[PDB]
Design a protein around this ligand. Structure first.
Ligand SMILES: O[C@@H]1CO[C@@H](O)C[C@@H]1O
Ligand SMILES: [Ca+2]
Ligand SMILES: [Ca+2]
Ligand SMILES: [Ca+2]
Ligand SMILES: [Ca+2]
Ligand SMILES: [Ca+2]
Length: 182
């Protein structure tokens, strides 16, 4: 049985190898069990300095979500997160606008909808629009990593053509696709 909560299933992975791109982080995820798990209920993380993977920086980065960490990871030079679950969206057009250091990829119903395939100091990208064909819980996953230094990850979403954006949080997230009452 998988726990039902108003959030995405979160996994954190650390490494002492360099993360340069999405492929490197996905390979890290493939290579071992998560260094920690957590509930991603308020996906607006950071900003901080001096490496996400060292000391208590992950806790600080995750903020309101850190109280759900399964363990306190040891130090690494590089690290990142893999989030997966469901997000309630009505049929219509949407676009992400993401602030991040380093890179990331977000997919909805298996299709990439926001990609930065490289390292970067903090930068905000307004991504191209996509459509949702049927109202309901949509499958969503995210990866984000830090190669070192500063770190931030805030992927906001607009349903109104970029006039207003919201953080993905417990209002609309579901870990399993069932309706959370938590
Ligand atoms: O990863 C970013 C780009 O490289 C360095 O400037 C650190 C910074 O956080
Ligand atoms: Ca794994
Ligand atoms: Ca630690
Ligand atoms: Ca909390
Ligand atoms: Ca590094
Ligand atoms: Ca960084």
């Amino acid at each position: 049985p998988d726990s039902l909560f108003a959030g995405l299933v979160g996994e954190y992975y650390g490494t002492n190898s360099q993360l340069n791109n999405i492929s490197d982080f996905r390979a890290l995820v493939d290579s071992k069990e998560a260094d920690a798990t957590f509930e991603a209920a308020n996906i607006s993380y950071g900003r901080g300095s001096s490496d996400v993977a060292k000391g208590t920086h992950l806790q600080e980065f995750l903020g309101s979500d850190a109280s759900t960490l399964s363990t306190d990871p040891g130090d690494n030079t590089d690290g990142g997160i893999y989030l997966q679950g469901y997000v309630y969206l009505e049929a219509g057009t949407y676009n992400f606008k993401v602030t991040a250091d380093d890179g990331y990829e977000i997919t909805i119903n298996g299709n990439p909808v926001a990609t930065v395939d490289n390292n970067q100091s903090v930068y905000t990208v307004t991504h191209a629009s996509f459509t949702i064909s049927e109202s309901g819980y949509q499958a969503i996953d995210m990866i984000w990593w830090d190669q070192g230094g500063d770190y931030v990850f805030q992927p906001t979403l607009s349903a109104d053509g970029g006039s207003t954006y919201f953080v993905l949080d417990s209002a609309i997230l579901s870990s399993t696709g069932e309706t959370p009452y938590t």
